[PDB]
From a paper:
Other molecules closely related to the thiobarbiturates were identified as interesting binders: barbiturates 11 and 12, triazine 13, and condensed bicycles 14–16. The X-ray crystal structures of compounds 13 and 15 confirm their binding, again showing the sulfur atom interacting within the lipophilic tryptophan cage. Compound 15 can establish all of the interactions previously discussed: in addition to the interactions of m6-adenine, it can interact with both D422 and D528. Unfortunately, the multiple interactions of compound 15 do not translate into a very strong binding (IC50 = 86 μM). Moreover, in the present campaign the crystal structure of DF2 in the complex with compound 15 guided the derivatization of compound 14, which has a similar scaffold and binding mode. We were not able to determine the crystal structure of 14 in complex with DF2. Thus we hypothesized a similar binding mode as in the crystal structure with compound 15. Figure A shows the two reference poses obtained for compound 14 compared to the crystal structure of compound 15. In pose A, the carbonyl oxygen interacts with the backbone NH of Y418, as observed for the crystal structure with compound 15.
The YTH (YT521-B homology) domain-containing proteins are a family of RNA-binding proteins that specifically recognize N 6-methyladenosine (m6A), the most abundant internal modification in eukaryotic RNA. In contrast, the DF proteins (DF1, DF2, and DF3) are mainly cytoplasmic and play essential roles in mRNA translation, stability, and degradation. Our study focuses on DF2, which is involved in multiple types of cancer, including prostate cancer, MYC-driven breast cancer, and acute myeloid leukemia (AML). We have also presented the crystal structures of DF2 in complex with six ligands, which represent six distinct chemotypes (compounds 3–6, 13, and 15).
Author numbering: 400 to 548
Write the structure that this text describes.
């Protein structure tokens, strides 16, 4: 639907791939997330360089689920020294705030014809955790998720 995301002139969009639906549920409940060590650094740099000029959006998907499960906006820098063991595995260390926008399952069939020119033209549905999405393809994904019924 062209009602959604028609004014995102700046900003950046990443794929989040979780091993745990329970971690997603905790993220939705408390509006926080944590990535890999390298993923935290990549999101941190994107959020910091944006300096509030636009949104950093996160497109969430559970590994193996065959569907994306929602969209959240990054709402803080990464805090690296935080309470241990709050997620499904102890290896998830650190925290940043998010704001969930959509919580809805969207089948990969609706998205797999969107290909990423920064990832060897592979379907967006074949992305790994914290793959960055070109802005014009991200707008396409965001509108599909937003309007899917
Ligand atoms: O399974 C996960 N759980 C948390 S909390 N963060 C993640 N990043 N990538 C995968 C995961």
């Amino acid at each position: 639907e062209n009602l959604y995301f028609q004014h995102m002139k700046h900003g950046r969009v990443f794929i989040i791939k979780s091993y745990s639906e329970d971690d997603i549920h905790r993220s939705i409940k408390y509006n926080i997330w944590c990535s890999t060590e390298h993923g935290n650094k990549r999101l941190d740099a994107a959020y910091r360089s944006m300096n509030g000029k636009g949104p950093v959006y996160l497109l969430f998907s559970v590994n193996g689920s065959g569907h994306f499960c929602g969209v959240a906006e990054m709402k803080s820098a990464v805090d690296y020294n935080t309470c241990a063991g709050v997620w499904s595995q102890d290896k998830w260390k650190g925290r940043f705030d998010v704001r969930w926008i959509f919580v809805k399952d969207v089948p990969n069939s609706q998205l797999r014809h969107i290909r990423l020119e920064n990832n060897e033209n592979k379907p967006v549905t074949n992305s790994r955790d914290t793959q960055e999405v070109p802005l014009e393809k991200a707008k396409q994904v965001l509108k599909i998720i937003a309007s899917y019924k």
